[PDB]
């Protein structure tokens, strides 16, 4: 369920799900480094009927995981709304910007 692109919290993921890459939805695979920045999505939880802010931090400093590629775009906006935008590398400010995978971190209610 969590490893599917249609899992509710992955509604604005453009990348590889870290849970398919030796990590989990909220932990980086071994040897990959969290990004301090992210794009944000607002995703509806069909199970409890509420909407949540999700922060799509990347894991960085390893080459592409290649598993569970997703490209979902709910509420995603272009780069003039920069932190709502998912066509950029959220590893861009890391010590090593190589993109490994994307996490879906629950922040709270929207």
């Amino acid at each position: 369920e969590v490893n599917s692109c249609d899992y509710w919290r992955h509604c604005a993921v453009d990348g590889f799900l870290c849970s398919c890459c030796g990590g989990t939805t909220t932990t980086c695979p071994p040897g990959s480094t969290p990004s301090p920045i992210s794009w944000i999505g607002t995703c509806h939880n069909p199970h409890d009927g509420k909407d949540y802010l999700i922060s799509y931090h990347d894991c960085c400093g390893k080459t592409a995981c290649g598993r569970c590629q997703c490209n979902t775009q709910t509420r995603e906006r272009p780069g003039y709304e920069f932190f709502l935008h998912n066509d950029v590398n959220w590893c861009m400010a890391n010590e090593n910007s190589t993109f490994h995978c994307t996490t879906s971190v629950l922040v709270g209610l929207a």
Partner: protein, 359 residues
């Protein structure tokens, strides 16, 4: 027989197209693939390391790439660069150092552009704070960081001025930058609000005329920026949609999703039915051909799941690209005619460009 190197591309420049292959599955080995659009022949390639961007010099003589290196790829010191490559030999000539904040992201045209006069490369930075970087081609140097563009995104050159360009800002307006002959900002101006960021966001890809640009919105509206004068005049919306189109929820979708045929004013747009929140990057069900003077559609054709396009004015051509395959269309008449498809041009490309012939 004796094996030799040092050879030039086998087809004339006017036949060449550049398919920017991100190779997202192995993004550290992105590259540009060079094809002959007349026959589908692969002509050569330029390696572009991690998430490269590419453009061809306006004079047709050089290829410019933008990329990121690290000393040990996944560790060590970062070097963001522009490289200058010979267009005919496909060889590396010069590295231009950038600050370590060049945009890493998908290959929208507007992230890596040049002034109309070809003397300056104009590129998007994100640290993640945004600014526009200026590279002086003759000097081989990064010469200006346009911090006035903070909170803005992408570069739309003005084809009627030598060193002017616009960017789309968070206020829903456009910032115009006019560079001096030294590449430093000589003047700037800000338009009134063109579009509501919240209520009718635009795609960043311009349908660019000589003295104006059109933009399409997430909901199928059209906005325009007229830069015939020093101050940009903005207007819109008009709708791409008639009542029947609205009933089936047609909306635009794609990446480099529009184009303009300047002689006719026809605007080309990738569209799909059943639009709703989250479908703005969907492949094209159709290409619509819009008369921008009458603000009405003139034709519609199958979209072939295309995501990005580009237009050649002088040969009246449109290329479309579905991520892997390039379709070549004749647009000399209102209904485009498919001439051929180049299969397997890329693994993961969202951008194709013609070799310039206009000088």
């Amino acid at each position: 027989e004796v094996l030799t190197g040092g050879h030039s591309v086998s087809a004339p420049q006017e036949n060449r197209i550049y398919v920017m292959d991100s190779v997202f599955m192995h993004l550290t080995e992105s590259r540009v693939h060079v094809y002959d659009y007349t026959n589908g022949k692969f002509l050569g390639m330029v390696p572009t390391a991690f998430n490269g961007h590419v453009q061809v010099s306006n004079d047709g003589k050089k290829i410019y790439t933008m990329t990121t290196y690290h000393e040990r790829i996944t560790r060590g010191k970062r070097s963001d660069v522009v490289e200058v490559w010979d267009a005919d030999k496909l060889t590396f000539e010069k590295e231009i150092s950038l600050p370590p904040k060049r945009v890493q992201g998908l290959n929208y045209d507007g992230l890596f552009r040049q002034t109309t006069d070809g003397k300056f490369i104009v590129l998007q930075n994100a640290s993640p704070a945004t600014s526009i970087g200026i590279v002086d081609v003759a000097k081989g140097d990064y010469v200006e960081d346009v911090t006035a563009a903070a909170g803005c995104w992408s570069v739309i050159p003005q084809p009627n001025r030598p060193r002017s360009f616009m960017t789309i800002c968070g206020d829903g307006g456009l910032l115009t930058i006019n560079l001096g002959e030294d590449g430093k900002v000589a003047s700037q101006s800000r338009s009134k609000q063109m579009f509501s960021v919240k209520d009718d966001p635009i795609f960043i890809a311009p349908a660019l005329d000589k003295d104006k640009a059109h933009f399409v919105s997430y909901y199928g509206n059209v906005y325009s920026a007229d830069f015939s004068g020093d101050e940009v005049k903005v207007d819109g919306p008009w709708s791409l949609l008639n009542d029947e189109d609205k009933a089936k929820n047609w909306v635009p979708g794609g990446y480099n999703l529009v184009g303009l045929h300047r002689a006719s004013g026809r605007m080309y747009v990738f569209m799909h039915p059943d639009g709703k929140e989250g479908t703005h990057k969907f492949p094209a069900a159709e290409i619509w051909v819009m008369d921008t003077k009458t603000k009405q559609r003139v034709a519609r054709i199958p979209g072939r799941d295309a995501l990005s396009m580009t237009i050649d004015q002088q040969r009246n051509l449109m290329l479309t690209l579905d991520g892997g395959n390039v379709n070549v269309y004749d647009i000399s008449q209102p209904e485009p005619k498919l001439l051929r498809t180049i299969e397997g041009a890329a693994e993961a490309s969202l951008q194709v460009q013609f070799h310039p012939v206009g000088g």
